[PDB]
Amino acid sequence: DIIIATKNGKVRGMQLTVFGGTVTAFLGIPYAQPPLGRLRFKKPQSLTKWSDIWNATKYANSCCQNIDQSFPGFHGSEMWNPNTDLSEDCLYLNVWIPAPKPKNATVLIWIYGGGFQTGTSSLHVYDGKFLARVERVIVVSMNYRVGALGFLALPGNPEAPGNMGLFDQQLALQWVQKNIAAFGGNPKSVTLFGESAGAASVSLHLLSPGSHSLFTRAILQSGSFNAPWAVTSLYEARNRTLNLAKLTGCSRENETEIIKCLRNKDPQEILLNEAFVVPYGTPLSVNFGPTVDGDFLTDMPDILLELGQFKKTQILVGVNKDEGTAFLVYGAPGFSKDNNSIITRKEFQEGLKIFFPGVSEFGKESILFHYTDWVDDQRPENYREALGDVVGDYNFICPALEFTKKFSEWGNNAFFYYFEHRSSKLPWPEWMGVMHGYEIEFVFGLPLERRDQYTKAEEILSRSIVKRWANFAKYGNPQETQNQSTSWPVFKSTEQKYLTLNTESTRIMTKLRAQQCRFWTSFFPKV
Template sequence: MWNPNTPVSEDCLYLNVWGPHYKTPTPRPEDRVPVLVWIYGGAFVSGTSTLDVYQGHFLCKSQNVVVVSMNYRLGPLGFLAINGNQHIRGNQGLLDQRLALKWVVDNIAAFGGDPKKITIFGESAGAASVGFHLVSPGSQGLFQRAVMQSGAPNAAWAIATKNEIYERSLKLAKLINCPVDYPARLEYCLLNADPKNLFLKQYENLVPPSVLPYPFVPHIDGDFVPSDIETLLNSSTLPNKELLIGLNKDEGTYFLFYGMPGFTREGESLITRKNFIEGLPLVMTNSSEIVKEAGISYYTDWRDENNTKSNRDEMARMVGDSLFNCPVVDFATRYAERGGKTFFYFFDHVSSKNPWPKWAGAMHGYEIEFVFGMPLNPVLKYQQDEITLANKTMQHYGDFARTGNPKFKGGDWPLFKANTQEYLSLNDDSTGVKKMLKANECHLWNNLFPKFQNMSDILRRCSSSGIVQYNWVFLLILLVISLTH
């Protein structure tokens, strides 16, 4: 479902539009409908708007909306940056998205869309992109509402510093034999490099091994991304747009099949304790040893630490919590705290068409087929309850695009607030309101782990071994207290 169905090309800046049928050649202003603009995911390294799962005709027809999807540059073509070079400044992929949004504002009325009622929505890196537009001053005025599915710009995999991108870019330039000491020649070499070679070389040790080892992502450039996400969310100058944001039940399982020790694409992947310990550094790549020990402690069932099923499930939970669950909950909480009207969903249906092992559950990305109404295609022979779920999901999106409230059983969807964190559970047999999703796990990832990491960094800089020894004991005591309360 995710494999590209069109040739890979640097010439990719196209968009697609699905609009209602009108009896008149030019839609009248009073007939204009809301617009939903899709931004695909793929870790900022892969993806295309042409995938079958992104086809917008069912969503367009069922909700009487205009649906737009876009392409944007990826990997080094989209996010490589050279220090001091005005032509290769980075974040090209985000600028491509902004240009597409400007086109929509200027032209969508000709397709029957209302340029004053635009909702951007995306999944994974697409959701992180939506988040970047939400906090970027230059994107304000191009849309009114936003939907973020399983991704956020504050996730470690979604954002880098200037220096990180500069260093990775120079490493890549050296790998393709560009002269890095001569700015003009470096620029000429990069601009004339084979795009396929650039893409292949980006995987050669530019970043430490990890579960998501992709070096070229958006960075804090002082322009599109003026500062870190927390600072931007605290800014009083940004407007508070309505936000629908959410997660799938088993966000982590998809990524286990791509290089995590002991996991295979067939069978139960019952991993050993050794596999679990070997896999942990790929999740907590930049963490100190004490933080890794805390991770092991929290995600181990100490009643039976060698239980292979438990080791598998806990590794899946750790990957999901670190990459998606806790960054998304953190973004939603901060956005709600600043006054943004926020709605949260939790998708826990396992598609009957999911080709992965059953234990993998409601995986990352597998809500998209319901958002776009894929089960309504009779050729695919989805189950009747899945057709119902697809219609219900599209109705939520249509209501949100029209009114700013996704609605719930004819009433209002409860607001997600920092103190109560109410969210809606979406599945085929029941839909109910719950509270405090992943509260314990996200307290760990969003609060305790950063504090322990900061303390570890301070201790590393201490010159006196006596002070270091004393402080490590103090840190261990704090760790035990924190994890047992």
Template sequence: TMFQIKQISFRCLQVCNLLMSFLIISANADHDNIVKVKQGQVSGIELSIQSGYVTAYLGIPYGEPPTGRLRFKKTEPRKPWHGVLKAETFGKSCFQNREEKFAEFPGTEIFLVNNEMSEDCLHLNVWVPSAKPKDAHVMVFIHGGGFESGTTSLDIYDGSVLAYAERVIVVSMNYRVAAFGFLALPGHKDAPGNAGLFDQRLALQWVSENIAAFGGNPDNVTIFGHSAGAASVGFHLISPGSYAYYNRAIVQSGAVTSNWAINSEERAKRLTMKLAEFLECPHTDNDAIITCLINADPILLTEKQLLAKEPYDLTQFLPIVDHDFLVDVPENILEQSMKRTEILIGITKDDGNPFTLIYSSDFNIKTESSFSSEELQKRLKRFFPSAGDLGVQSILLQYKDWEDGNNDEKNREAMELILRDYFFTCPVKSFARYAVEHQNNVFVYVYDHRSSTDPWPEWMGALHGAELPMLFGKPFINKGHYTKSELFFSKTIMKFWANFARTGSPNVDEEDGFVWPLYSLKDEKYAVLKLSGSEVHQKLSMRNCQFWNFFFPSLLKLVK
């Protein structure tokens, strides 16, 4: 499903439950690393990196286990514990399905949950550079996974190198996903929706209350997220209850303006009813249904969600307008207000990959490199079931290379661009437009680098998530697998992100000639981040975004 196909451009050498083997873990149960937080004491683990080390505090519980009546509702802050909590291994992951049908793709392995699952999964991780900083800037990461999968214990999200290289404190949290995080019967007190977003907010509140004890500055917190995590960052930008807990925001390949980021009340209700049916719940009344879902075995509940999926659906349980976290649909809120702050937002050059593989008749990656005009049309019908023939024709008119209509490779490229623009480019541009209209400083990027370790076929380019290995400093720990220039590039990306967290601008003082311009509605300048040196371009996908943001919605109204 959309973000579980979760793909990325590089090979995870081993998905390990503990930290990566390259880190020489000092057997130093040093008392210096005991930290006192509101709930009690925690001790961390020292990890050697290059010539220094970071202290990692892994699996700190921040919320009470959301079980029983709390299964689909917001939970409370964790109760205090006695003694010293050993925070040396990641906490359990929240319940989710491993996407088996994509398992043979080498690039998906790094996104599949790699440890035990439990409803007691509300844990967070803190990576602190040493020597312990004073008043360090804090960067809190929200993982993606289409709101139905993902966990912080994945190798790719390890925060140690970023913390070490930029002397920032990096935090990541697990939050409930899939039905546990987003099942809703709108208006019902035991399943009001958005539990997963409230988990994230609770983790942000924990950071605000406790990060000073680790040497962090609670008044300098930047939230950054990828994919569904980027949409989550967007939700915190339009939900005033979150404003106090962070300052700046980084939005990577996802936006609240994306159609995949939110469910209508009708769809939320339909999915809940469908799941209840597969679990053989009585459908006498809503109370009975919710009670049955609350009492269902979590493993069974997780498995049955796959059956309750509607054919060709990319995502399933999603945030909704619950009149609590979200008072209205995102566009309506954005017309009125959003948090005043600086925002860094962007996409990857080939963000539509590997979603081009979805709905292909066979999942053989080797033969997947092109397809016929008929195949293109067939897939568009599956992706846009409500568009009708006219809708599909309009998309083809906009994207197909009509001078070379039977070129399979060009058809494949058209499909990739359609998905990139519809899922990412145009929602991101629309969100950036609102942000600028609210007088926020906005920096926009297109990340254009395909990792040399990328296991996906070359034609996929800089696909969805391509920036993550560089942002989390993978070339520093898998040295033999990346080029020297990638090591340098990774440094640059970490510097851009951390600088933005520190100052509200990604620009570095050093004279390297590249100045990343502010995004304005007049010239729409943005940075293209490349290995060979970044460039400034302007007016990203103007014509295509006119199509998706204005023409296509009007056409759909006519078709209906």
């Protein structure tokens, strides 16, 4: 039995055997008052002390959210769906610490993705016990509100100010600052890491002054705030809030009575209307996400980035080779996870209309022009891969590169990676390649489990990534120094060196997606 006294009371954990050693897991520690009743849509309130022993013995409830039901029974989609009960009572976090209790361990704080609409800390690919066992770090992960319950926004209105999910995260980071030393963690050695919307959340904490003092360093996998899906303007956020009130029959003149009415609706009626606050949506629709609230975000974030107004520290940023393929089977015509999805020129044009609905004909033609100059017009998969790269380059790769250029320009060390290994256990078909979200299991060291049917070369790769992530956390330098590994150079805006991650050859390259990103970053914003 192992019990830790926290500032709010005692918590009991559990012992796990990992690789012939022991990890202590505290699953489901509350870090806030449950945001129920009159607390729905408001910022999280600070937890009141308890005097019992909280049994942190099971993952807690996941936050309310819609579920991907497009491929029932298919592990490739269902592995991302919540694996605990849905509840508005969901503000809880998990702690994995090595056994024996370390003395001053670097802490790694995971923020999950899911488009700000979905996600939960309890997923199998976010299990921090391997990192705790192997690198002797402490891993913290938290649930935070998503969807309209997490990001409904009426400007300057404390009944629904926006960004509550980001404030959920920030109160967890605070909890770590006040409590993790009881668990043997170093509150001065805290690294945030996240993927997708989680990565965008990490980039926004670097911009939020209230988060400056709650962490040391940041890791951003496949995501950043300047991605086109990541931040909503105060305009549309208020328009979407009011469209939701119409749909639920909550339209009122006094905007506070609107929220009060919305607080008496059942979570399911809110959830089943989120998708319609927008006239035309896409597979990448983020109907309720971060806004410039004037609180978490004190100005438009593109301006803060550009003028150097952010936490000065090291970053580790990266993307996957086929970021965009996952979304093609969620609407684009001619695509299937069950066939090779060879599409025609006409199908590719219709695909752009799905993914760029509110764009001019000239804007959509400009995409087609830049992506259909073929090395061989007789290759039958030209259009299939073009649309994948279009969605990937626009939504993930080019924003990530541009974040890294702009952040490094202010003097901080930056490190960029290009993950190009396709999991040998990946359930999706091969044309989808190195998919969005499928470096996570390597970062968390699941292929270090010999029982789980990865290849030996996948064990070696995960091992080396895990050491690089941990050295970055502890020391700000993502090297693997013992096993002749390729040195990871810093990313400067001049030379733009990045490192490729794969089972074969780890390589230094320059200027990833150079031509593609000059289009997305310096032409397409004008259309």
